[PDB]
């Protein structure tokens, strides 16, 4: 697709999130770069409103799958790049086992050379002594397969996966992505993305933050 040509090199990224979980409002901003040729994302996130009222790892999935590396034989299945530069809307619900849920809406699109992911998140029904509001999560390495199928009536895709974070907390993620523009997109055969991520800290950063390194690779079609 033509969208694909936009990702041939290193692309700067801006990520922005306004959130409200059980009435606790906050905001996060992040920046870095993506290199789809390697499926590689490197980002640093800051909580601009002070202390994050939820654990950083619970926000990773919310905080740009257009940077996935699609092998050559699968490139006709890359919906995400095909929707660019006009972009796509990503809507998710995340159901935390025995606890609350997040509902999110994001617009992912190019603003000139910058890929911008602008998000709103609302979280409800969380328990005060649950794992999310009680901040009980580890902060290490994860790998999850992200399953994708076409949603042809909406000219987009439907996505599902599970996460697990050690305290273990389970979450079911359900996602729908729809193009912003009216032009043609690639509607994929069923496949999945390997999503491998590592969180860390910047030793010189005083603000509440997260450094993220992520490698995303499409698979599941022989
Ligand atoms: Cl994986
Ligand atoms: Zn925490
Ligand atoms: Zn809004
Ligand atoms: Zn493992
Ligand atoms: Zn989790
Ligand atoms: Zn994997």
């Amino acid at each position: 697709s033509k969208g694909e040509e936009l990702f041939t090199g290193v692309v700067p990224i801006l990520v922005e999130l306004d959130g409200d979980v059980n009435g606790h409002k906050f905001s996060v901003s992040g920046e870095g770069e993506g290199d789809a040729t390697y499926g590689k994302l490197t980002l640093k996130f800051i909580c601009t409103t002070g202390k994050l009222p939820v654990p950083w790892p619970t926000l990773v999935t919310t905080l740009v799958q257009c940077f996935a590396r699609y092998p050559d034989h699968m490139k006709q299945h890359d919906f995400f790049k095909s929707a660019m530069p006009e972009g796509y809307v990503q809507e998710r619900t995340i159901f935390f086992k025995d606890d609350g849920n997040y509902k999110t809406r994001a617009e992912v699109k190019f603003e000139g050379d910058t890929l911008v992911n602008r998000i709103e998140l609302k979280g409800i029904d969380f328990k005060e002594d649950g794992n999310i509001l009680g901040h009980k999560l580890e902060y290490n390495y994860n790998h999850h397969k992200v399953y994708i199928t076409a949603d042809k009536q909406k000219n987009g895709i439907k996505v599902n996966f599970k996460t697990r974070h050690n305290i273990v907390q389970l979450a079911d993620h359900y996602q729908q992505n729809t193009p912003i523009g009216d032009g043609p997109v690639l509607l994929p055969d069923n496949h999945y993305l390997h999503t491998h991520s590592k969180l860390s800290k910047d030793p010189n950063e005083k603000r509440d933050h997260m450094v993220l390194l992520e490698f995303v690779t499409a698979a599941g079609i022989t």
Side-chain angles (χ1 to χ4, degrees), residues 95-102 104-108 110-126 130-137 139 141-150:
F95 295 102
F96 291 90
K97 185 179 188 80
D98 293 322
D99 212 335
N101 63 88
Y102 290 167
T104 68
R105 183 188 186 275
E107 289 184 5
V108 184
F110 275 99
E111 290 185 350
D113 291 329
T114 297
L115 191 285
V116 182
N117 183 19
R118 198 163 22 80
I119 314 147
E120 294 182 327
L121 174 158
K122 175 143 193 210
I124 59 166
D125 293 333
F126 285 92
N131 292 322
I132 290 85
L133 293 184
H135 260 273
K136 312 185 184 191
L137 305 227
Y139 192 86
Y141 181 87
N142 292 295
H143 51 98
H144 296 112
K145 294 177 174 196
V146 170
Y147 295 97
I148 299 168
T149 187

Short mmCIF file of all heavy atoms in Angstrom, two decimals, residues 95-150, unseen atoms left out:
data_model
loop_
_atom_site.label_atom_id
_atom_site.label_comp_id
_atom_site.label_asym_id
_atom_site.label_seq_id
_atom_site.Cartn_x
_atom_site.Cartn_y
_atom_site.Cartn_z
N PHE A 95 -11.06 -5.78 30.38
CA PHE A 95 -11.77 -6.29 31.53
C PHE A 95 -10.74 -6.95 32.45
O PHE A 95 -10.16 -7.97 32.08
CB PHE A 95 -12.81 -7.33 31.12
CG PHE A 95 -13.94 -6.78 30.26
CD1 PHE A 95 -13.95 -6.98 28.90
CD2 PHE A 95 -14.99 -6.11 30.83
CE1 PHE A 95 -15.00 -6.50 28.11
CE2 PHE A 95 -16.04 -5.62 30.05
CZ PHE A 95 -16.04 -5.83 28.69
N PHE A 96 -10.51 -6.35 33.61
CA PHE A 96 -9.57 -6.91 34.57
C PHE A 96 -10.31 -7.93 35.42
O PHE A 96 -11.32 -7.61 36.02
CB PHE A 96 -8.98 -5.82 35.46
CG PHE A 96 -8.06 -4.89 34.72
CD1 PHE A 96 -8.54 -3.75 34.11
CD2 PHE A 96 -6.71 -5.20 34.60
CE1 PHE A 96 -7.69 -2.90 33.41
CE2 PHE A 96 -5.85 -4.37 33.91
CZ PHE A 96 -6.35 -3.21 33.30
N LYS A 97 -9.78 -9.14 35.49
CA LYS A 97 -10.40 -10.20 36.26
C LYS A 97 -10.58 -9.81 37.72
O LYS A 97 -9.64 -9.35 38.38
CB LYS A 97 -9.55 -11.48 36.16
CG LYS A 97 -10.19 -12.68 36.84
CD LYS A 97 -9.30 -13.91 36.67
CE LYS A 97 -9.99 -15.17 37.18
NZ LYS A 97 -10.95 -15.69 36.15
N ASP A 98 -11.80 -10.01 38.22
CA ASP A 98 -12.15 -9.70 39.60
C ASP A 98 -12.04 -8.22 39.93
O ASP A 98 -11.95 -7.86 41.09
CB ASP A 98 -11.28 -10.51 40.57
CG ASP A 98 -11.57 -11.99 40.50
OD1 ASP A 98 -12.76 -12.34 40.35
OD2 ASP A 98 -10.62 -12.81 40.63
N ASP A 99 -12.10 -7.34 38.94
CA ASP A 99 -11.83 -5.94 39.20
C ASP A 99 -12.53 -5.07 38.14
O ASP A 99 -13.47 -5.51 37.50
CB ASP A 99 -10.32 -5.68 39.20
CG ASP A 99 -9.90 -4.57 40.17
OD1 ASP A 99 -10.73 -3.69 40.48
OD2 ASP A 99 -8.72 -4.57 40.62
N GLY A 100 -12.05 -3.86 37.95
CA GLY A 100 -12.71 -2.92 37.06
C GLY A 100 -12.40 -3.11 35.60
O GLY A 100 -11.86 -4.13 35.17
N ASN A 101 -12.78 -2.11 34.80
CA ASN A 101 -12.46 -2.14 33.40
C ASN A 101 -12.04 -0.76 32.91
O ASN A 101 -12.41 0.25 33.50
CB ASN A 101 -13.65 -2.64 32.57
CG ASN A 101 -14.86 -1.75 32.68
OD1 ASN A 101 -15.01 -0.80 31.91
ND2 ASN A 101 -15.72 -2.03 33.66
N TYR A 102 -11.24 -0.77 31.85
CA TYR A 102 -10.85 0.45 31.12
C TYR A 102 -11.59 0.43 29.81
O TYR A 102 -11.68 -0.62 29.15
CB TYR A 102 -9.36 0.45 30.75
CG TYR A 102 -8.34 0.62 31.85
CD1 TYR A 102 -6.99 0.37 31.60
CD2 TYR A 102 -8.69 1.03 33.12
CE1 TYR A 102 -6.04 0.52 32.58
CE2 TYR A 102 -7.74 1.17 34.12
CZ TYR A 102 -6.41 0.92 33.84
OH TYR A 102 -5.44 1.05 34.82
N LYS A 103 -12.10 1.59 29.41
CA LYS A 103 -12.57 1.80 28.04
C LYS A 103 -11.77 2.94 27.44
O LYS A 103 -11.60 3.99 28.06
CB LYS A 103 -14.06 2.12 28.04
CG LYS A 103 -14.95 0.96 28.49
CD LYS A 103 -16.42 1.28 28.25
N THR A 104 -11.25 2.70 26.24
CA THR A 104 -10.36 3.67 25.61
C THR A 104 -10.75 3.98 24.16
O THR A 104 -11.30 3.14 23.43
CB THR A 104 -8.87 3.21 25.61
OG1 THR A 104 -8.69 2.08 24.75
CG2 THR A 104 -8.42 2.83 27.00
N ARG A 105 -10.48 5.22 23.77
CA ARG A 105 -10.61 5.61 22.38
C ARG A 105 -9.38 6.35 21.98
O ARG A 105 -8.97 7.27 22.68
CB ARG A 105 -11.86 6.48 22.18
CG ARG A 105 -12.09 6.86 20.74
CD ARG A 105 -13.21 7.89 20.61
NE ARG A 105 -13.53 8.15 19.21
CZ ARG A 105 -12.89 9.03 18.44
NH1 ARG A 105 -11.90 9.77 18.94
NH2 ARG A 105 -13.25 9.18 17.17
N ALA A 106 -8.77 5.97 20.86
CA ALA A 106 -7.54 6.64 20.40
C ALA A 106 -7.64 6.98 18.93
O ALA A 106 -8.30 6.27 18.18
CB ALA A 106 -6.34 5.74 20.63
N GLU A 107 -7.01 8.09 18.52
CA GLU A 107 -6.89 8.43 17.11
C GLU A 107 -5.42 8.37 16.82
O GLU A 107 -4.62 9.01 17.50
CB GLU A 107 -7.48 9.83 16.79
CG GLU A 107 -9.00 9.83 16.88
CD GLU A 107 -9.63 11.14 16.46
OE1 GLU A 107 -8.90 12.05 16.00
OE2 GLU A 107 -10.87 11.25 16.61
N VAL A 108 -5.06 7.55 15.82
CA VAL A 108 -3.68 7.34 15.45
C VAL A 108 -3.54 7.82 14.02
O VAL A 108 -4.26 7.36 13.14
CB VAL A 108 -3.30 5.84 15.54
CG1 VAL A 108 -1.80 5.66 15.23
CG2 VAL A 108 -3.68 5.26 16.92
N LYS A 109 -2.66 8.79 13.78
CA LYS A 109 -2.55 9.39 12.46
C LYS A 109 -1.26 10.18 12.35
O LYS A 109 -0.63 10.51 13.35
CB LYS A 109 -3.73 10.32 12.16
CG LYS A 109 -3.71 11.64 12.90
CD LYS A 109 -5.02 12.45 12.66
N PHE A 110 -0.83 10.45 11.12
CA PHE A 110 0.31 11.31 10.91
C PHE A 110 -0.11 12.78 11.01
O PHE A 110 -1.16 13.16 10.51
CB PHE A 110 0.94 11.07 9.55
CG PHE A 110 1.92 9.95 9.55
CD1 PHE A 110 1.56 8.70 9.10
CD2 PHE A 110 3.22 10.15 9.99
CE1 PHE A 110 2.48 7.65 9.09
CE2 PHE A 110 4.15 9.10 9.99
CZ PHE A 110 3.77 7.86 9.55
N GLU A 111 0.73 13.55 11.68
CA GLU A 111 0.73 15.00 11.62
C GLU A 111 2.09 15.39 11.01
O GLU A 111 3.09 15.50 11.70
CB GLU A 111 0.53 15.58 13.02
CG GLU A 111 -0.89 15.36 13.61
CD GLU A 111 -1.09 16.05 14.97
OE1 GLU A 111 -0.09 16.55 15.53
OE2 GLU A 111 -2.25 16.11 15.46
N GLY A 112 2.13 15.58 9.70
CA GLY A 112 3.39 15.76 9.01
C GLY A 112 4.21 14.48 9.16
O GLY A 112 3.69 13.40 8.90
N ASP A 113 5.46 14.60 9.60
CA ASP A 113 6.32 13.44 9.76
C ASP A 113 6.11 12.69 11.07
O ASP A 113 6.69 11.61 11.26
CB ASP A 113 7.78 13.85 9.73
CG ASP A 113 8.21 14.32 8.37
OD1 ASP A 113 7.67 13.83 7.35
OD2 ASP A 113 9.11 15.17 8.35
N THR A 114 5.31 13.24 11.97
CA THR A 114 5.15 12.65 13.30
C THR A 114 3.90 11.77 13.38
O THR A 114 2.81 12.16 12.96
CB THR A 114 5.13 13.75 14.42
OG1 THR A 114 6.39 14.42 14.45
CG2 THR A 114 4.91 13.14 15.78
N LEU A 115 4.09 10.56 13.90
CA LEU A 115 2.98 9.65 14.12
C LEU A 115 2.46 9.95 15.53
O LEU A 115 3.20 9.85 16.51
CB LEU A 115 3.45 8.20 13.95
CG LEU A 115 2.41 7.09 13.88
CD1 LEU A 115 1.82 6.81 15.26
CD2 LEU A 115 1.35 7.39 12.86
N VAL A 116 1.20 10.36 15.60
CA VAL A 116 0.59 10.79 16.85
C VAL A 116 -0.51 9.83 17.27
O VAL A 116 -1.38 9.51 16.48
CB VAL A 116 -0.04 12.21 16.72
CG1 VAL A 116 -0.63 12.66 18.09
CG2 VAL A 116 0.98 13.18 16.27
N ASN A 117 -0.44 9.40 18.53
CA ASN A 117 -1.43 8.52 19.15
C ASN A 117 -2.08 9.30 20.29
O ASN A 117 -1.46 9.54 21.31
CB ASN A 117 -0.74 7.27 19.71
CG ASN A 117 -1.71 6.29 20.31
OD1 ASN A 117 -2.89 6.34 20.01
ND2 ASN A 117 -1.21 5.39 21.14
N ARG A 118 -3.31 9.77 20.08
CA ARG A 118 -4.01 10.61 21.02
C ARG A 118 -5.15 9.80 21.63
O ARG A 118 -6.05 9.35 20.93
CB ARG A 118 -4.52 11.86 20.28
CG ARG A 118 -4.88 13.03 21.14
CD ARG A 118 -4.98 14.36 20.32
NE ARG A 118 -5.20 14.10 18.91
CZ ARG A 118 -6.39 13.81 18.38
NH1 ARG A 118 -7.46 13.80 19.15
NH2 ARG A 118 -6.48 13.54 17.07
N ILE A 119 -5.12 9.64 22.95
CA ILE A 119 -5.99 8.70 23.63
C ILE A 119 -6.79 9.30 24.78
O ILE A 119 -6.30 10.13 25.53
CB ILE A 119 -5.15 7.57 24.28
CG1 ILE A 119 -4.09 7.02 23.32
CG2 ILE A 119 -6.04 6.46 24.74
CD1 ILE A 119 -2.82 6.59 24.06
N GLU A 120 -8.00 8.78 24.95
CA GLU A 120 -8.79 9.04 26.14
C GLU A 120 -9.16 7.70 26.78
O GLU A 120 -9.55 6.79 26.10
CB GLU A 120 -10.06 9.85 25.82
CG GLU A 120 -9.71 11.31 25.33
CD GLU A 120 -10.91 12.22 25.03
OE1 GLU A 120 -11.96 11.72 24.58
OE2 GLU A 120 -10.81 13.47 25.22
N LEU A 121 -9.04 7.64 28.09
CA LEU A 121 -9.28 6.42 28.84
C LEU A 121 -10.20 6.70 30.01
O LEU A 121 -10.04 7.70 30.73
CB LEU A 121 -7.94 5.86 29.33
CG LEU A 121 -7.99 4.65 30.27
CD1 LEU A 121 -6.66 3.93 30.22
CD2 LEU A 121 -8.30 5.05 31.71
N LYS A 122 -11.17 5.82 30.20
CA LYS A 122 -12.03 5.88 31.36
C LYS A 122 -12.05 4.53 32.04
O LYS A 122 -12.27 3.51 31.39
CB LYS A 122 -13.45 6.26 30.97
CG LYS A 122 -14.38 6.21 32.17
CD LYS A 122 -15.41 7.29 32.17
CE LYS A 122 -16.10 7.39 33.53
NZ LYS A 122 -17.50 7.86 33.36
N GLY A 123 -11.81 4.53 33.34
CA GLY A 123 -11.75 3.30 34.10
C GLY A 123 -12.79 3.36 35.20
O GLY A 123 -12.91 4.38 35.87
N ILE A 124 -13.56 2.28 35.36
CA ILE A 124 -14.60 2.25 36.40
C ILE A 124 -14.67 0.93 37.14
O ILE A 124 -14.14 -0.08 36.67
CB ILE A 124 -16.01 2.52 35.82
CG1 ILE A 124 -16.37 1.48 34.76
CG2 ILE A 124 -16.08 3.91 35.25
CD1 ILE A 124 -17.85 1.46 34.38
N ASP A 125 -15.33 0.98 38.29
CA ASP A 125 -15.65 -0.20 39.08
C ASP A 125 -14.41 -0.88 39.65
O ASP A 125 -14.43 -2.08 39.93
CB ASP A 125 -16.44 -1.21 38.24
CG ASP A 125 -17.83 -0.71 37.87
OD1 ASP A 125 -18.39 0.11 38.61
OD2 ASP A 125 -18.36 -1.14 36.82
N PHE A 126 -13.32 -0.13 39.84
CA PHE A 126 -12.13 -0.72 40.43
C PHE A 126 -12.24 -0.80 41.94
O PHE A 126 -12.88 0.05 42.56
CB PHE A 126 -10.88 0.02 40.00
CG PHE A 126 -10.48 -0.28 38.59
CD1 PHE A 126 -10.94 0.50 37.54
CD2 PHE A 126 -9.70 -1.40 38.31
CE1 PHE A 126 -10.61 0.21 36.24
CE2 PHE A 126 -9.37 -1.71 37.02
CZ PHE A 126 -9.81 -0.90 35.97
N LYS A 127 -11.65 -1.86 42.52
CA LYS A 127 -11.63 -2.08 43.97
C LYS A 127 -10.45 -1.34 44.61
O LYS A 127 -9.34 -1.33 44.07
CB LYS A 127 -11.50 -3.58 44.29
CG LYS A 127 -12.63 -4.45 43.76
CD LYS A 127 -12.49 -5.92 44.19
N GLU A 128 -10.70 -0.73 45.76
CA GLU A 128 -9.67 0.04 46.46
C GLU A 128 -8.47 -0.84 46.81
O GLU A 128 -7.33 -0.39 46.73
CB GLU A 128 -10.25 0.67 47.73
N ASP A 129 -8.73 -2.08 47.19
CA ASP A 129 -7.67 -3.01 47.59
C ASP A 129 -7.37 -4.02 46.50
O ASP A 129 -6.71 -5.04 46.75
CB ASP A 129 -8.06 -3.73 48.89
N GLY A 130 -7.84 -3.75 45.29
CA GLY A 130 -7.51 -4.58 44.15
C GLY A 130 -6.08 -4.32 43.73
O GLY A 130 -5.38 -3.49 44.31
N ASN A 131 -5.64 -5.03 42.70
CA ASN A 131 -4.26 -4.92 42.25
C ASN A 131 -3.97 -3.62 41.51
O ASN A 131 -2.83 -3.19 41.46
CB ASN A 131 -3.90 -6.12 41.37
CG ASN A 131 -3.85 -7.41 42.15
OD1 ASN A 131 -3.39 -7.44 43.29
ND2 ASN A 131 -4.33 -8.49 41.54
N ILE A 132 -5.00 -3.00 40.96
CA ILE A 132 -4.78 -1.85 40.09
C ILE A 132 -4.66 -0.58 40.94
O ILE A 132 -3.64 0.09 40.89
CB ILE A 132 -5.84 -1.76 38.97
CG1 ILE A 132 -5.64 -2.89 37.95
CG2 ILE A 132 -5.73 -0.46 38.18
CD1 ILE A 132 -6.30 -4.18 38.31
N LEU A 133 -5.66 -0.29 41.76
CA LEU A 133 -5.59 0.86 42.66
C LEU A 133 -4.62 0.66 43.84
O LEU A 133 -4.12 1.63 44.41
CB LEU A 133 -6.98 1.21 43.21
CG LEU A 133 -7.98 1.73 42.18
CD1 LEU A 133 -9.27 2.12 42.89
CD2 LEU A 133 -7.40 2.91 41.38
N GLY A 134 -4.37 -0.60 44.20
CA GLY A 134 -3.41 -0.92 45.24
C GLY A 134 -1.96 -1.02 44.75
O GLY A 134 -1.07 -1.32 45.54
N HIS A 135 -1.72 -0.78 43.46
CA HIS A 135 -0.36 -0.72 42.93
C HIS A 135 0.49 -1.90 43.41
O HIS A 135 1.37 -1.74 44.26
CB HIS A 135 0.33 0.58 43.36
CG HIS A 135 0.34 1.65 42.32
ND1 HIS A 135 1.33 1.75 41.36
CD2 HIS A 135 -0.49 2.70 42.11
CE1 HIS A 135 1.09 2.80 40.59
NE2 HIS A 135 -0.01 3.39 41.03
N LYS A 136 0.23 -3.08 42.88
CA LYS A 136 0.92 -4.27 43.34
C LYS A 136 1.67 -5.01 42.22
O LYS A 136 1.98 -6.18 42.38
CB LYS A 136 -0.09 -5.22 44.01
CG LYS A 136 -1.00 -4.53 45.03
CD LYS A 136 -1.90 -5.52 45.77
CE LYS A 136 -2.86 -4.79 46.71
NZ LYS A 136 -3.58 -5.70 47.63
N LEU A 137 1.96 -4.32 41.12
CA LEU A 137 2.47 -4.99 39.92
C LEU A 137 3.99 -5.00 39.81
O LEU A 137 4.66 -4.04 40.20
CB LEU A 137 1.92 -4.34 38.64
CG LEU A 137 0.41 -4.19 38.43
CD1 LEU A 137 0.01 -4.65 37.03
CD2 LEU A 137 -0.39 -4.89 39.46
N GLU A 138 4.52 -6.08 39.25
CA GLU A 138 5.91 -6.12 38.83
C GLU A 138 6.08 -5.35 37.52
O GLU A 138 5.11 -4.98 36.86
CB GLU A 138 6.38 -7.56 38.64
N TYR A 139 7.33 -5.15 37.13
CA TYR A 139 7.68 -4.14 36.15
C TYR A 139 8.84 -4.69 35.36
O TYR A 139 9.99 -4.27 35.54
CB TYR A 139 8.07 -2.89 36.93
CG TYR A 139 8.22 -1.61 36.15
CD1 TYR A 139 7.12 -0.80 35.89
CD2 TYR A 139 9.47 -1.19 35.72
CE1 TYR A 139 7.27 0.39 35.19
CE2 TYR A 139 9.63 -0.01 35.03
CZ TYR A 139 8.53 0.78 34.76
OH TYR A 139 8.70 1.96 34.06
N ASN A 140 8.56 -5.66 34.50
CA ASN A 140 9.61 -6.37 33.79
C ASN A 140 9.32 -6.63 32.31
O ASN A 140 9.06 -5.72 31.53
N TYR A 141 9.38 -7.91 31.95
CA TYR A 141 9.30 -8.33 30.56
C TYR A 141 7.99 -9.09 30.29
O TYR A 141 7.59 -9.93 31.09
CB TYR A 141 10.50 -9.23 30.26
CG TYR A 141 10.55 -9.73 28.84
CD1 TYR A 141 11.15 -8.97 27.85
CD2 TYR A 141 10.01 -10.96 28.49
CE1 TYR A 141 11.20 -9.40 26.54
CE2 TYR A 141 10.05 -11.41 27.17
CZ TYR A 141 10.66 -10.61 26.20
OH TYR A 141 10.73 -11.02 24.89
N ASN A 142 7.37 -8.81 29.16
CA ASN A 142 6.15 -9.52 28.75
C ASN A 142 6.12 -9.87 27.28
O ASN A 142 6.76 -9.20 26.46
CB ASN A 142 4.92 -8.65 29.04
CG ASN A 142 4.68 -8.47 30.51
OD1 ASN A 142 4.38 -9.44 31.22
ND2 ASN A 142 4.83 -7.24 31.00
N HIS A 143 5.36 -10.90 26.95
CA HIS A 143 5.13 -11.28 25.56
C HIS A 143 3.71 -11.80 25.41
O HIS A 143 3.29 -12.69 26.16
CB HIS A 143 6.14 -12.34 25.10
CG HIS A 143 6.25 -13.49 26.03
ND1 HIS A 143 5.58 -14.67 25.81
CD2 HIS A 143 6.91 -13.64 27.20
CE1 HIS A 143 5.83 -15.50 26.81
NE2 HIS A 143 6.64 -14.89 27.65
N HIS A 144 2.97 -11.22 24.48
CA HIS A 144 1.58 -11.60 24.25
C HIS A 144 1.28 -11.59 22.78
O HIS A 144 1.71 -10.70 22.05
CB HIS A 144 0.61 -10.67 25.01
CG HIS A 144 0.77 -10.77 26.50
ND1 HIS A 144 1.28 -9.74 27.27
CD2 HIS A 144 0.53 -11.79 27.35
CE1 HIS A 144 1.35 -10.14 28.53
NE2 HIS A 144 0.90 -11.37 28.61
N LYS A 145 0.58 -12.61 22.33
CA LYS A 145 0.12 -12.66 20.95
C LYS A 145 -1.18 -11.87 20.83
O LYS A 145 -2.08 -12.05 21.65
CB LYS A 145 -0.11 -14.11 20.55
CG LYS A 145 1.16 -14.94 20.51
CD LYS A 145 0.81 -16.39 20.17
CE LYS A 145 2.05 -17.29 19.95
NZ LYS A 145 1.63 -18.55 19.26
N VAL A 146 -1.26 -11.03 19.80
CA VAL A 146 -2.41 -10.11 19.58
C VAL A 146 -3.13 -10.55 18.31
O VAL A 146 -2.57 -10.47 17.20
CB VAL A 146 -1.90 -8.66 19.49
CG1 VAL A 146 -2.97 -7.68 19.01
CG2 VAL A 146 -1.33 -8.21 20.84
N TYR A 147 -4.32 -11.12 18.48
CA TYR A 147 -5.03 -11.76 17.37
C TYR A 147 -5.89 -10.76 16.59
O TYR A 147 -6.64 -10.00 17.17
CB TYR A 147 -5.91 -12.90 17.87
CG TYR A 147 -5.05 -14.01 18.46
CD1 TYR A 147 -4.83 -14.09 19.82
CD2 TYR A 147 -4.41 -14.93 17.63
CE1 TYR A 147 -4.00 -15.07 20.35
CE2 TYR A 147 -3.60 -15.94 18.16
CZ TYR A 147 -3.40 -15.99 19.52
OH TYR A 147 -2.61 -16.96 20.09
N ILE A 148 -5.76 -10.82 15.28
CA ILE A 148 -6.41 -9.88 14.38
C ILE A 148 -7.28 -10.60 13.36
O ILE A 148 -6.87 -11.60 12.75
CB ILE A 148 -5.34 -9.09 13.61
CG1 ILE A 148 -4.47 -8.29 14.59
CG2 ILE A 148 -5.98 -8.17 12.55
CD1 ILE A 148 -3.22 -7.71 13.95
N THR A 149 -8.50 -10.09 13.17
CA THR A 149 -9.35 -10.56 12.09
C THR A 149 -9.99 -9.33 11.44
O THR A 149 -10.06 -8.25 12.05
CB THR A 149 -10.44 -11.51 12.62
OG1 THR A 149 -11.16 -12.09 11.54
CG2 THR A 149 -11.40 -10.82 13.53
N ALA A 150 -10.44 -9.49 10.20
CA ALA A 150 -11.13 -8.42 9.49
C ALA A 150 -12.50 -8.13 10.10
O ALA A 150 -13.16 -9.04 10.60
CB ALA A 150 -11.32 -8.80 8.04
#
